[PDB]
Amino acid sequence: SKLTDPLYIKKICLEKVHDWSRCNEDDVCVNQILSGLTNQLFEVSIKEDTAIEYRITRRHVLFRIYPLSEFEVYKTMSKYRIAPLLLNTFDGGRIEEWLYGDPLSIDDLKNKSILVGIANVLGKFHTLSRKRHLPEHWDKTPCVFKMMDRWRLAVSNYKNLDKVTLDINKYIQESHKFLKFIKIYTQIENIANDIVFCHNDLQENNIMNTNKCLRLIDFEYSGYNFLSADIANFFIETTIDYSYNAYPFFIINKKNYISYESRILFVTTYLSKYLDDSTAADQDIIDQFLEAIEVQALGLHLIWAFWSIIRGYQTFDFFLYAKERLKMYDEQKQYLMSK
Numbered sequence: 291s292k293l294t295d296p297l298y299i300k301k302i303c304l305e306k307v308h309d310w311s312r313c314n315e316d317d318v319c320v321n322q323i324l325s326g327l328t329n330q331l332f333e334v335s336i337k338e339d340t341a342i343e344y345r346i347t348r349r350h351v352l353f354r355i356y357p358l359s360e361f362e363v364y365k366t367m368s369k370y371r372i373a374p375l376l377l378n379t380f381d382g383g384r385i386e387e388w389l390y391g392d393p394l395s396i397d398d399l400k401n402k403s404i405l406v407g408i409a410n411v412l413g414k415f416h417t418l419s420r421k422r423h424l425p426e427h428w429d430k431t432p433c434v435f436k437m438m439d440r441w442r443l444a445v446s447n448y449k450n451l452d453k454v455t456l457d458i459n460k461y462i463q464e465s466h467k468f469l470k471f472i473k474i475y476t477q478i479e480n481i482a483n484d485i486v487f488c489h490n491d492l493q494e495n496n497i498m499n500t501n502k503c504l505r506l507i508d509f510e511y512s513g514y515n516f517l518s519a520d521i522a523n524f525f526i527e528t529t530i531d532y533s534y535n536a537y538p539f540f541i542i543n544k545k546n547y548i549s550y551e552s553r554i555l556f557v558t559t560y561l562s563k564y565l566d567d568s569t570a571a572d573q574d575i576i577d578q579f580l581e582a583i584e585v586q587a588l589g590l591h592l593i594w595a596f597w598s599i600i601r602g603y604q605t606f607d608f609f610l611y612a613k614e615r616l617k618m619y620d621e622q623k624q625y626l627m628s629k
């Protein structure tokens with residue numbers, strides 16, 4: 291695999307990237323980068339002296355080897371320059387614009403100026419639905435209903451769930467109680483309940499930063515959802531570090547949950563890009579908005595716990611991670627019911 295993959299990759303890029311066929315396999319550099327289990331990813335480049343030699347302008351590409359089709363969404367996202375530009379396709383993968391920065395770190399999410407930048411970008415991203423014409427066949431049923439329903443059904447079919455938690459049926463029961471609550475709750479006249487085209491996996495590793503220019507990647511879970519669910523996911527992710535490089539390959543720091551003041555600064559910045567100048571906007575917009583986010587956070591914990599259980603059964607400690615997201619459900623629920 292590791293020794294044989296590069297040669298395959300080199301041949302395709304030579305013929306699928308403009309001007310690269312001027313080179314040979316010896317001028318091209320393949321480097322596998324870290325990814326999820328759903329794809330293999332490689333930084334492919336040309337040797338820099340050879341790029342200057344052969345006057346090659348595009349020095350790097352991303353080589354990607356493989357409800358809503360991820361691909362269909364990705365190509366719409368690329369069209370509007372939200373995602374890295376699609377360069378080309380081959381059977382089994384795609385070649386994308388290479389982004390020069392780095393994913394945001396978990397500690398970046400503490401920086402207020404970065405939070406502001408994320409809120410600006412997310413505020414704009416969320417207007418796409420009303421400002422462009424998205425493919426109309428896309429299901430507009432909020433992904434919270436779909437993900438919760440689909441993934442809970444699948445977890446109910448498993449044997450040995452007590453090997454995840456003694457109290458698993460409590461959370462299977464919690465889920466449809468949440469869906470019924472969320473059916474009523476999101477009918478409140480508040481923009482947090484707007485249904486827009488959502489990323490659905492908003493987190494530091496999906497936000498590329500090039501010299502203070504923030505880009506979004508990874509549209510695998512993308513679809514229409516309550517706008518506050520995209521934001522709740524981001525807020526949650528301030529307490530989860532996936533960079534940790536030994537078992538269980540994630541670290542939870544709940545003390546790091548984005549502070550109240552940072553949350554108001556994020557929501558305010560967000561609304562300054564999401565809302566039109568002429569928006570019909572009440573006094574408690576921020577209060578209700580911050581409340582809807584915490585409400586959605588509750589469901590996300592279930593959604594991602596069930597997701598992680600399915601991955602555990604079909605394959606990072608997925609089960610410990612589910613367990614942790616369930617403890618978060620419990621904690622979040624106490625919090626909500628408090629106020």
Ligand SMILES: Nc1ncnc2c1ncn2[C@@H]1O[C@H](COP(=O)(O)OP(=O)(O)O)[C@@H](O)[C@H]1O
Pocket residue numbers: 323324325326327328329331352374386387388389390392393495496507508510
């Ligand atoms: N177009 C790109 N340019 C440079 N780096 C990328 C690009 N796309 C992804 N990466 C890197 O690979 C990682 C995973 O990419 P992504 O597709 O979002 O995740 P996954 O492969 O887990 O679905 C990112 O954190 C980023 O560092």
Ligand SMILES: [Mg+2]
Pocket residue numbers: 495496508
């Ligand atoms: Mg990702």
